[PDB]
Write a protein that binds this ligand. Structure first.
Ligand SMILES: O=C[C@H](O)[C@H](O)[C@H](O)COP(=O)(O)O
Ligand SMILES: O=C[C@H](O)[C@H](O)[C@H](O)COP(=O)(O)O
Lengths: 157, 157
């Protein structure tokens, strides 16, 4: 069982509440970063930055950010130092996010999937192991070093 | 109408990148190849994605496309570049919303996830859909930009 930080604007809110209940039922500890109620006009970035910041700060935890499409949400998460947020739109991409990218977070577009599809995405995300494979780690290290220095790494050739 | 487009890809997105480059030329746009310049099965996506994102941000009004197996590590990398907003485009709808809602200057595309026809449809939506300039979207982009400026997490409501 794992702590999972969730953040969502109004467009992801209802799906977020469903995911929280699903995660409880499957033995996880969901932590709601907000929104705590439906507010049709609310703004995703704060919730996504909160979820990403909290996830990165909490070893072994994962996070999930939801909105209409999930794309603004993952962009916002990805601005957090050390955060790696994939956009998960299928079981395959949720799984690869963990296996290849060691993503601590995924974005999900609430308007893009049925609830069943979304929960299947969440299941793949929370159950797929990070591979620890050499080449994937190398690539993550390159990105982390760019985050640290903003020195663009040279392109081969 | 015609857009300048910076492209970057690792080996997993290489063939698709070359097809997109030709497609963009054929449809009246100006593709600029940031690499990879040949197929290297072992090469590492971050450098190419950071290059494309960095050049896109430095050339306002340009767009960028980053490609790899899933596009997710690729967009994560792009999103580390100051001022870059890179959506994951997995459909015509999400490519369009990336422009409309997120004003994303870049998209990631997974070369292992789509047929070429499907990929080119995604590209067409991305390079043709206008940024909406709607108040609420500009507000959210500005909130994210301020967080990127200071790395001070904005309070949730
Ligand atoms: O990437 C952003 C996500 O799709 C948002 O939930 C969406 O933009 C919200 O739009 P609206 O409900 O304010 O029209
Ligand atoms: O996000 C990363 C992208 O999916 C890469 O193209 C992928 O990791 C390459 O996988 P492999 O060809 O090294 O197995």
């Amino acid at each position: 069982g794992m702590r999972v930080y969730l953040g969502a604007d109004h467009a992801g809110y209802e799906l977020k509440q469903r995911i929280i209940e699903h995660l409880k039922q499957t033995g996880h500890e969901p932590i709601d970063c907000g929104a705590l109620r439906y507010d049709a006009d609310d703004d995703y970035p704060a919730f996504c930055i909160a979820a990403a910041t909290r996830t990165v700060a909490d070893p072994g935890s994962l996070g999930i950010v939801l909105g209409g499409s999930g794309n603004g949400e993952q962009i916002a998460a990805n601005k957090v130092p050390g955060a790696r947020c994939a956009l998960a739109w299928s079981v395959q991409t949720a799984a690869l996010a963990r296996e290849h990218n060691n993503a601590q977070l995924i974005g999900i577009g609430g308007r893009m999937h049925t609830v069943a599809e979304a929960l299947a995405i969440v299941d793949a995300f929370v159950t797929t192991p990070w591979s620890k494979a050499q080449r994937h780690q190398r690539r993550i290290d390159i990105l982390a070093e760019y985050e640290r220095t903003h020195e663009a790494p040279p392109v081969p050739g």
